[PDB]
Design a protein around this ligand. Structure first.
Ligand SMILES: [Zn+2]
Lengths: 7, 195
């Protein structure tokens, strides 16, 4: 699983 | 957090954090570790036991072999930004990778702190078995998930509301107090989680 920060 | 506990957490992080090869900003890397040392030691110890590495990077995430498959891919929630993973300064989940220098809001993202947001994702997924998608947290998210801003991201994905709330809780006293006022049930949930 991969999750980016808040855009 | 007393002297010995911050030091213990830094010691745990010494077995989690991986520094990049080559030239990098050593002082800022140390500052990032110091911010991570504010996380409750129970979570850090669990990350270490699970051999989760926090990889600090001096270049783009997609220049690492393990993230090359994300070149050109638009992250979840980044639709319409015009950016792809090539442009994103941090990543959390089953791994953690973070560009040194990009901690603060505005450095290619709008999180309060890059490393805490990414590490929160790892804690959620690896340590707490996706608690952000549990019925208990979904109910809290349904009520409070639009109270911290960025509502088309934090208000739509419970795992993102969890990660950002966790970052507010652990960054500093000011953000911790802001979370308590905006999202009291989320604050109480995080308080109880650390027991
Ligand atoms: Zn995220």
């Amino acid at each position: 699983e991969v999750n980016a920060p808040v855009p | 957090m007393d002297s010995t506990t911050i030091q213990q957490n830094k010691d745990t992080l010494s077995q989690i954090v991986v520094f990049p090869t080559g030239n990098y900003d050593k002082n800022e890397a140390n500052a990032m570790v110091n911010r991570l040392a504010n996380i409750d030691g129970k979570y850090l110890n669990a990350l270490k036991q699970n051999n989760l590495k926090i990889k600090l990077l001096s270049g783009k995430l997609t220049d690492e072999k393990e993230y090359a498959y994300l070149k050109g891919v638009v992250p979840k929630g980044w639709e319409g930004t015009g950016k792809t993973w090539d442009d994103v300064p941090g990543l959390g989940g089953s791994t953690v990778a973070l560009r040194i220098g990009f901690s603060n809001k505005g450095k290619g993202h709008d999180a309060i702190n890059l490393e805490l947001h990414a590490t929160a994702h790892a804690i959620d997924h690896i340590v707490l078995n996706d608690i952000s998608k549990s019925a208990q947290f979904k109910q809290i998210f349904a009520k409070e998930g639009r109270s911290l801003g960025n509502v088309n991201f934090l208000g739509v994905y419970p795992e993102e509301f969890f990660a950002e709330s966790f970052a507010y809780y652990y960054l500093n006293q000011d953000t911790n107090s802001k979370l308590k006022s905006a999202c009291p049930q989320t604050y109480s949930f995080l308080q109880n989680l650390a027991k």
